[PDB]
Amino acid sequence: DIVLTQSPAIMSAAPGDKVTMTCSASSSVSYIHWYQQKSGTSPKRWIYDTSKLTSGVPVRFSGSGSGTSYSLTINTMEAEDAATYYCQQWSSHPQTFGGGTKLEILRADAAPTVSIFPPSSEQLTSGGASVVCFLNNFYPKDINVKWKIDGSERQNGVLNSWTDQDSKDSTYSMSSTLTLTKDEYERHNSYTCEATHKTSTSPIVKSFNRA
Amino acid sequence: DIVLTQSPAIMSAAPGDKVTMTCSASSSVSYIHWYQQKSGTSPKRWIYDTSKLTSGVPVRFSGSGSGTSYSLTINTMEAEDAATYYCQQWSSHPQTFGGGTKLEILRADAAPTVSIFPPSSEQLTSGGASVVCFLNNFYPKDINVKWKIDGSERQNGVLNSWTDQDSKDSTYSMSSTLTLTKDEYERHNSYTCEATHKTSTSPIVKSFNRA
Amino acid sequence: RRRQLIRQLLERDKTPLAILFMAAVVGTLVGLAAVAFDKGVAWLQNQRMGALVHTADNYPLLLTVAFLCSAVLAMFGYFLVRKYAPEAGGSGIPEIEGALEDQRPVRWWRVLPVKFFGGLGTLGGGMVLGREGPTVQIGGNIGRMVLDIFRLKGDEARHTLLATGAAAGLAAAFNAPLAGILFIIEEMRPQFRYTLISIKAVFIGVIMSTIMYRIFNHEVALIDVGKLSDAPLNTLWLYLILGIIFGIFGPIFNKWVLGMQDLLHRVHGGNITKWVLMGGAIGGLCGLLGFVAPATSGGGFNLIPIATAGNFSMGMLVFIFVARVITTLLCFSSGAPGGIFAPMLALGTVLGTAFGMVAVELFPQYHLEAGTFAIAGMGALLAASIRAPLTGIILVLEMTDNYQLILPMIITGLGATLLAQFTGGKPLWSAILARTLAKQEAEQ
Amino acid sequence: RRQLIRQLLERDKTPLAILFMAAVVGTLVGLAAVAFDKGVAWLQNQRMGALVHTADNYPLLLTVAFLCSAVLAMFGYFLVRKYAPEAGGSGIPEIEGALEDQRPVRWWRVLPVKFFGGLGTLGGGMVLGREGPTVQIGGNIGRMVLDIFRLKGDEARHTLLATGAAAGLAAAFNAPLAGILFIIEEMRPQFRYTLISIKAVFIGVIMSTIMYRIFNHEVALIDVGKLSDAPLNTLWLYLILGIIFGIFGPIFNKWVLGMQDLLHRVHGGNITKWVLMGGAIGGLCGLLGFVAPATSGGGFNLIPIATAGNFSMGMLVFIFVARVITTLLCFSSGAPGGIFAPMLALGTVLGTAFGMVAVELFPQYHLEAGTFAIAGMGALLAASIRAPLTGIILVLEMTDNYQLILPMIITGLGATLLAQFTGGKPLWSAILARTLAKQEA
Amino acid sequence: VRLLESGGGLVQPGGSLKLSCAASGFDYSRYWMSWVRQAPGKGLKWIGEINPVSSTINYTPSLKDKFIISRDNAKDTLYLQISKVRSEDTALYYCARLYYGYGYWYFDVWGAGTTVTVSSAKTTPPSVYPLAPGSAAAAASMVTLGCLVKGYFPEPVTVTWNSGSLAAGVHTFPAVLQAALYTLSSSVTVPSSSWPSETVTCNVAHPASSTKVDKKIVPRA
Amino acid sequence: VRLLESGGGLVQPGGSLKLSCAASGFDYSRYWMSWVRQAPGKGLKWIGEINPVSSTINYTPSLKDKFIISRDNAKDTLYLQISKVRSEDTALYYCARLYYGYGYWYFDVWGAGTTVTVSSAKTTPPSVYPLAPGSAAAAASMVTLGCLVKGYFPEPVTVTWNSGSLAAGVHTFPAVLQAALYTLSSSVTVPSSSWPSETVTCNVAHPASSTKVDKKIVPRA
Ligand SMILES: [Br-]
Ligand SMILES: [Br-]
Ligand SMILES: [Br-]
Ligand SMILES: [Br-]
Numbered sequence A, B: 001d002i003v004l005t006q007s008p009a010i011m012s013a014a015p016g017d018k019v020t021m022t023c024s025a026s027s028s029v030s031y032i033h034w035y036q037q038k039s040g041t042s043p044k045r046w047i048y049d050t051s052k053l054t055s056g057v058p059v060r061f062s063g064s065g066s067g068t069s070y071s072l073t074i075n076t077m078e079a080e081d082a083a084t085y086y087c088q089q090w091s092s093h094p095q096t097f098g099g100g101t102k103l104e105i106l107r108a109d110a111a112p113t114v115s116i117f118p119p120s121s122e123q124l125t126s127g128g129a130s131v132v133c134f135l136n137n138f139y140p141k142d143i144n145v146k147w148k149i150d151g152s153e154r155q156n157g158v159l160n161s162w163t164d165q166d167s168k169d170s171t172y173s174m175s176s177t178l179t180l181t182k183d184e185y186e187r188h189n190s191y192t193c194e195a196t197h198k199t200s201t202s203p204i205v206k207s208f209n210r211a
Numbered sequence C: 001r002r003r004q005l006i007r008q009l010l011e012r013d014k015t016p017l018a019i020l021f022m023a024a025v026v027g028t029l030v031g032l033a034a035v036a037f038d039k040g041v042a043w044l045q046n047q048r049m050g051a052l053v054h055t056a057d058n059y060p061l062l063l064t065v066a067f068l069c070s071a072v073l074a075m076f077g078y079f080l081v082r083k084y085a086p087e088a089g090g091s092g093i094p095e096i097e098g099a100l101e102d103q104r105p106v107r108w109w110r111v112l113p114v115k116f117f118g119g120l121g122t123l124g125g126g127m128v129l130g131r132e133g134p135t136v137q138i139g140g141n142i143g144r145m146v147l148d149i150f151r152l153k154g155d156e157a158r159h160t161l162l163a164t165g166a167a168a169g170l171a172a173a174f175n176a177p178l179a180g181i182l183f184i185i186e187e188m189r190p191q192f193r194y195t196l197i198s199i200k201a202v203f204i205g206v207i208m209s210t211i212m213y214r215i216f217n218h219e220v221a222l223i224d225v226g227k228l229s230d231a232p233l234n235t236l237w238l239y240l241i242l243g244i245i246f247g248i249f250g251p252i253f254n255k256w257v258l259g260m261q262d263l264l265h266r267v268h269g270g271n272i273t274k275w276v277l278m279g280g281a282i283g284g285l286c287g288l289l290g291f292v293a294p295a296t297s298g299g300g301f302n303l304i305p306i307a308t309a310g311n312f313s314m315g316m317l318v319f320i321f322v323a324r325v326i327t328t329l330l331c332f333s334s335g336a337p338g339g340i341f342a343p344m345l346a347l348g349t350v351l352g353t354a355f356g357m358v359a360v361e362l363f364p365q366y367h368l369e370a371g372t373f374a375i376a377g378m379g380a381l382l383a384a385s386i387r388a389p390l391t392g393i394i395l396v397l398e399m400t401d402n403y404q405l406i407l408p409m410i411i412t413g414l415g416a417t418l419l420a421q422f423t424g425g426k427p428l429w430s431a432i433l434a435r436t437l438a439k440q441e442a443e444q
Numbered sequence D: 001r002r003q004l005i006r007q008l009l010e011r012d013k014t015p016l017a018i019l020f021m022a023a024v025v026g027t028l029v030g031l032a033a034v035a036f037d038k039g040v041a042w043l044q045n046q047r048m049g050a051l052v053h054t055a056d057n058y059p060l061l062l063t064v065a066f067l068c069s070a071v072l073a074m075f076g077y078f079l080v081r082k083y084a085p086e087a088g089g090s091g092i093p094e095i096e097g098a099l100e101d102q103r104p105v106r107w108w109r110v111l112p113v114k115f116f117g118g119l120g121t122l123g124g125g126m127v128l129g130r131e132g133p134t135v136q137i138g139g140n141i142g143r144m145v146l147d148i149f150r151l152k153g154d155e156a157r158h159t160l161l162a163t164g165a166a167a168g169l170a171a172a173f174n175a176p177l178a179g180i181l182f183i184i185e186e187m188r189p190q191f192r193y194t195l196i197s198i199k200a201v202f203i204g205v206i207m208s209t210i211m212y213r214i215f216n217h218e219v220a221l222i223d224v225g226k227l228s229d230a231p232l233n234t235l236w237l238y239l240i241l242g243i244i245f246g247i248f249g250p251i252f253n254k255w256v257l258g259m260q261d262l263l264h265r266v267h268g269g270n271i272t273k274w275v276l277m278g279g280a281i282g283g284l285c286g287l288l289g290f291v292a293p294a295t296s297g298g299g300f301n302l303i304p305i306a307t308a309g310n311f312s313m314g315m316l317v318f319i320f321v322a323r324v325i326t327t328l329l330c331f332s333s334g335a336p337g338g339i340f341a342p343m344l345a346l347g348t349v350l351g352t353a354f355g356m357v358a359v360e361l362f363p364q365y366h367l368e369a370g371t372f373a374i375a376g377m378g379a380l381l382a383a384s385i386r387a388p389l390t391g392i393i394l395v396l397e398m399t400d401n402y403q404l405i406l407p408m409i410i411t412g413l414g415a416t417l418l419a420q421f422t423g424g425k426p427l428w429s430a431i432l433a434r435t436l437a438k439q440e441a
Numbered sequence E, F: 001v002r003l004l005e006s007g008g009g010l011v012q013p014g015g016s017l018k019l020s021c022a023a024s025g026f027d028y029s030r031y032w033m034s035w036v037r038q039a040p041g042k043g044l045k046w047i048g049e050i051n052p053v054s055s056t057i058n059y060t061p062s063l064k065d066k067f068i069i070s071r072d073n074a075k076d077t078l079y080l081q082i083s084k085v086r087s088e089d090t091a092l093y094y095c096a097r098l099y100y101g102y103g104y105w106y107f108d109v110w111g112a113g114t115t116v117t118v119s120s121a122k123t124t125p126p127s128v129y130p131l132a133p134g135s136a137a138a139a140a141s142m143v144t145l146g147c148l149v150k151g152y153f154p155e156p157v158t159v160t161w162n163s164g165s166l167a168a169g170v171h172t173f174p175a176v177l178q179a180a181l182y183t184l185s186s187s188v189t190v191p192s193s194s195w196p197s198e199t200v201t202c203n204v205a206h207p208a209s210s211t212k213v214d215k216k217i218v219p220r221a
Helices: A182-186 B182-186 C002-009 C017-051 C059-084 C093-100 C108-124 C132-148 C155-174 C177-188 C199-217 C233-268 C272-292 C303-309 C314-333 C341-362 C371-378 C381-386 C389-400 C403-421 C428-441 D002-008 D016-053 D058-083 D092-099 D107-123 D131-147 D154-173 D176-187 D198-216 D232-267 D271-291 D302-307 D313-332 D340-361 D370-377 D379-385 D388-399 D402-420 D427-440
Strands: A010-013 A022-025 A033-037 A044-048 A064-066 A069-071 A083-089 A102-105 A113-117 A128-136 A144-149 A152-154 A158-160 A173-181 A190-196 A204-209 B004-006 B010-013 B019-025 B033-037 B044-048 B061-066 B069-074 B084-089 B101-105 B114-117 B128-138 B144-149 B152-154 B158-162 B172-181 B190-197 B200-209 E002-006 E009-011 E017-024 E033-038 E044-050 E057-059 E077-082 E091-100 E105-110 E114-118 E127-131 E142-152 E170-172 E182-191 E201-206 E211-216 F002-006 F015-024 F033-038 F044-050 F057-059 F067-072 F077-085 F091-099 F106-110 F114-118 F127-130 F142-144 F147-152 F158-161 F176-178 F181-186 F189-191 F201-206 F211-216
Touching: A033 F106, A044 F106, A113 A190, A113 A204, A128 A144, A128 A182, A128 A190, A128 F147, A144 A158, A144 A173, A173 A182, A173 F181, B004 B084, B010 B019, B019 B084, B019 B101, B033 E105, B044 B061, B044 E105, B069 B084, B114 B190, B114 B200, B114 E142, B128 B182, B128 B190, B128 E142, B128 E182, B144 B172, B144 B200, B172 B182, B172 E182, C002 D427, C017 C059, C017 C108, C017 C132, C017 C155, C017 C199, C059 C108, C059 C272, C093 C132, C093 C155, C093 C177, C093 C428, C108 C132, C132 C155, C132 C341, C155 C177, C155 C199, C155 C389, C177 C199, C177 C389, C177 D176, C177 D388, C177 D402, C199 D232, C199 D388, C199 D402, C233 C272, C233 C314, C233 C341, C233 C371, C233 C381, C233 C403, C233 C428, C233 D198, C272 C314, C303 C314, C303 C341, C303 C371, C314 C341, C341 C371, C341 C381, C371 C389, C371 C403, C381 C389, C381 C403, C381 C428, C389 C403, C389 D176, C389 D198, C389 D402, C403 D176, C403 D198, C403 D388, C428 D002, D016 D058, D016 D107, D016 D131, D016 D154, D016 D198, D016 D271, D058 D107, D058 D271, D092 D131, D092 D154, D092 D176, D092 D427, D107 D131, D131 D154, D131 D340, D154 D176, D154 D198, D154 D388, D176 D198, D176 D388, D232 D271, D232 D313, D232 D340, D232 D370, D232 D379, D232 D402, D232 D427, D271 D313, D302 D313, D302 D340, D302 D370, D313 D340, D340 D370, D340 D379, D370 D379, D370 D388, D370 D402, D379 D388, D379 D402, D379 D427, D388 D402, E002 E091, E017 E033, E017 E091, E017 E114, E033 E077, E033 E105, E044 E077, E044 E091, E077 E091, E127 E201, E127 E211, E142 E201, F002 F091, F015 F033, F015 F091, F015 F114, F033 F067, F033 F077, F033 F106, F044 F067, F057 F067, F077 F091, F127 F201, F127 F211, F147 F201, F158 F181
Parallel strands: A010 A102, B010 B101, E009 E114
Antiparallel strands: A022 A069, A033 A044, A033 A083, A064 A069, A083 A102, A113 A128, A128 A173, A144 A152, A144 A190, A158 A173, A190 A204, B004 B019, B019 B069, B033 B044, B033 B084, B061 B069, B084 B101, B114 B128, B128 B172, B144 B152, B144 B190, B158 B172, B190 B200, E002 E017, E017 E077, E033 E044, E033 E091, E044 E057, E091 E105, E091 E114, E127 E142, E142 E182, E170 E182, E201 E211, F002 F015, F015 F077, F033 F044, F033 F091, F044 F057, F067 F077, F091 F106, F091 F114, F127 F147, F142 F189, F147 F181, F158 F201, F176 F181, F201 F211
């Protein structure tokens, strides 16, 4: 069947900006359709039959192309333009959609607000101990996180978790969690957390001591 | 609002008979409808626009009339025709219904089939004592049921019920119910139900003994 | 002659009240007449189905009585014609057309009782012919009759009443007011010179006979197909293709029906006894078939709704098609009284439904419902054989009521008339009339 | 007889040359019609846009509504009076004349004048219809491709001129059938035989209908839903409704004709008093297109509303009178634009009115007034213009309630009869007859 | 094609009640709907008719809002509020689908009926008692059993033997009333070569209280 | 218009389940219906379609009886059954109404979706834990708190703070699955003058296990 590859897979552009996701075809197709998807919400139909806006769609969007290559476009991109755009054909059977293209708000670089958390007394009361590192509100999304237990590098027992771009500042976030057995955690004093991020060479160190 | 009145209110006739009821209306009506309301069912469009037949209505049925009088006619009426029949106009507004003609079938004799039932233990362990008697499938409809507690005649607290005339075999059926307290029924032994009918000169008596 | 035109323009649309009244009458009559004819054929077809029960067990004894009564009725019809009015055989539509060009007589005192009872015979025995033949022709004479009986004078009044009659006749045959009127002004009027047929008059006559029909047939459509789906534009091409198939095949069918008349004439040589027997033979075949394979016999109207729904297999559809091409030829060609119109609609539907099935399967992306191709094909054979597309198209629209298919319907119709023109076929009625007018002359 | 046999066996053989040309005529007329359609939308839009810029200050907005309808009106009345006087009014009468070979077909002039001229008058919300412009425009498109391709013959000249006008109407209401029927009912030389090829007309229409559906698909001009049925004990009411339209149809013709006469005195034929008077009336329209929208405009809007029975009886009488006035004013004043569409609107409104009365005098009939609307919709076309078959079909193609075909037919016939018996003439034949005499006189 | 009306039963004199009639089998717009009623052992009195688009509503001569006939095409349901109820309203209510011949209009398909009972009383479920033969059981080729349905209010109840698979041989006698309580019985006659050899159960049903009792006829102890 | 679909959840591998889509705000016939599924952070894949006369039902190149689309225009409902449920069938499932323009078909209106997890792990409440900041942190401008929701299955938990009336400066990170259990953390921010002078609660709900829990974030003693 027909394969639809959307060129930019992820991308950013500052509000008011010419954006241009692609959609290429394995064979030859006619009159493709486009869907906007915000996170945790149903796809919406955007642009169909190579180029007609849907009742409701702001007039800044526009599709075009033919044969093998098509494209959605936002002349003067917007705040609420952040979402995924999935192309789709049905010129041949069966239909097929595209990989997706994530539109993301580009913004002003921000250094992470790091926070560190000592295992709750309730967790210990069950033999586990989880040390939590929050790396809140930073642009770009790229960041590295390092744990140091009594000044020493630790790798296992760590689980990271990025959020998708915040709809309030188009920041990001991350959470690193170090899970140990209670015994294990008790036999060390000084747990630290290290944020290496674009916006400095000196990584942000945040840590506490059990004394 | 047109006042419609129906020929015989009640009319007998033995199958074979050609039979004709009438709908006569106070002012002038036209294209009237006839409904059949068999006993215990809902009315059924029977004849409509004075003489067209609703589908599946046997051809033995005819309608006609004009002006202020209309007639529905059964040429060789059959026993299954036993019903109340309604006429209805809607040539003026509001529409209006006849008063009904109740067709009754004349038939050969049919002796009753008497069945006697003692109070049930369920009803005994609750306070009362109903002694039921069924007399089933008799013609004609007139029958006398009489109650005898230990030979003695009883008339206090007796309650009868007849069914309407059946629509395949044109027989009648009836039920007599004697009601007593637990105490009242237990201070006696031999209960009897007596049935007198055209179909014989001596009462059919059916009875039970507690002991 | 400009002055002359200003004179006529200011004088336009003034049909004498005399002729307008007579149309009313003609229509009423033709309507009743058609209603009555309609009832008769039902009755006889019903007797035949009744008698068939009475002999339900002995199998060969049943196949026997099915044949013998269709046989007896066919014969009775073929006779009434061959003996008392030869000009009322076959369709009679070509014959009424001739009447308009003033080239054939209109012997009503003869035709009326012959066509009427004769067809009542052929149709009633379950032959593959249509009600419209008898009703259209019958109607023309009823218009002749009221022109004579009332001694109305003048070209207008003669052409008008003869027309409104034929309209009222068709109108009453399919409960199709429009198709009837359109029939007169598309395929019925003198095709090469001007004529004075009053279209307002035709109107009244059709209105009257449609009322008459509706008074006795109310609340039961000849065909009932339900509202079918829609037609995307990326689908229209398929209907053009379907038109072409009908267009290459329409002329062929015409050759067949004509050559078939020629060939069947050799069997009875023109002899009224070999005819009436050969007639009762074909007719007998029909009533037998109307029982062992009912879709190959009869008028055809029953299987429209069935095929359109897509309830026939593809094999079954091919079977029905071939079987009916054979029986439709055999019945009309053999000059039995009764039209060819109706069985043509049946073949169209069946052919179209067939195309539709193939279509549906080669193009799942189109989301087709084969029942549309059935409707587009239904009046397609009338478009390529008859060559009166406008009339066929509207007729279908009045009986199937899926106006949303008007574009495909048209495209398939035009597809047919074009390829029937470019593959050299003539209008099967103008052809029939042309043979008749020569057949007169060639022997003198 | 030996002559006829020759013709019968020769029937329906229109040269492939002419059939091909029909296809292009239709395609062109289709596009043209589509484009014209869009223009009027645009210009009406601007007027609604500018109207919001001046939303407060009431008399200031009533001013701008007027002034640009006025400015657009004038612009059209000019393009006509100056560069092609023969394209004022309807043009349906002018194309009819072309077929009898009694009027010219100055396409090089008419095309650009009717098109932009109408875009003017229609766009400013005048009470005229798209079909005038499109039908006429269509005939010339057919003339043009006959010239530009030097096609010889009576047939090829009459055929292209016809298919053009058909594709013209077809594209005006998405009415393929009404289109074809128009040619063979009211548009061909009415008194002598002609060589118009119905097959060619077919192709042209198909092409233009496809063109229209390509750009307007998925939105019907009128949408009424499926109304109820018609009991036979009810048909007489439709015949009565036909008679009212039949006594009124001729009256209207008198008014429109006499109104042309009367409006001529106000400008005396003077291109400056005309263009001013034109922008006057056209100004009036765009003012009214705001303070009482149902009196102005083409009329298509209120059909669905009236058929649903949403207007009071008072309102219906108002709309009627108001519109009889504006429709006369607009068409009679020779503004480029047809009279077809506003007539449909009057019929609907008149019918719906009859409907309401009918509905309360006969509750036993269980009437829905919306059917009298539909039977009356093409009734005015039946009694004024006198082409009922074409009107009936047109309505059926736009309202899609085939189940009312008998009442529709009965009201139609009721009209054409009483229009005949009360002395009215076909408003198109009348207009032409005025033109031809005004010519040899 | 069926109409199944509901929501009748006990009402306080003066109080109101919404009867619902659910349609199925047929396209429910397209059709005018109507309500007719029958007081016990009497005639058909028309009430109202609503059209498809809820725009025309007619009523028998009545006051302000005695009746209100609405309908909701989303649900294929007709309704009928009855207000300030006096005892003349105690009747069976039919919902019936309208239609015409030549055009004078008729009540095409009729419903089954809901029963409205205007009274001061208490909805009471019936006591079901089995009626099996006494010991003098002279068991002839056929045998007769019944079950006794007493002490309920209001009407109707519906008795079926063996979930209606025992149809032939049944009589259900019309209720008699006493001190605002109804009482009826039902007899089934069956071949003795089929009982006690086999189950005989009566299914009494009293919708006013949504109760069903299923008594099984025990050959007497 | 509302496309609402239900019926997904936890199924053991090799098992099977029936998904229900129930249409409102329109005529459900005339319209072809479709299912399309989206497997966690990934492509849209089309399962199949069905026409209103149910006479044509098409499915994607897929195993003989893996999917059974069916519909009931009477209830206004579209159905999908998946059989021999492997884990590739873990996805968000969407019903959609089908349309077109030029006749090249598009997916007109979609549902919200239902999620199907195919896994043999056991449904399991989550344990909630506060994340108050430690004895060595400066009580600055804005203070970052949080709460940890660990060892639950399956997805999802809902986390809010003070019944969601503290939505500015919230953060909930995606869960991570490890050893057949899920874990996630939520971060609220408040002004220093806000907390701890005022109470901060976090409210977690993991309905798959009937867990409604609130854990107050207290200052560490
Ligand atoms: Br013939
Ligand atoms: Br024929
Ligand atoms: Br004009
Ligand atoms: Br006009």
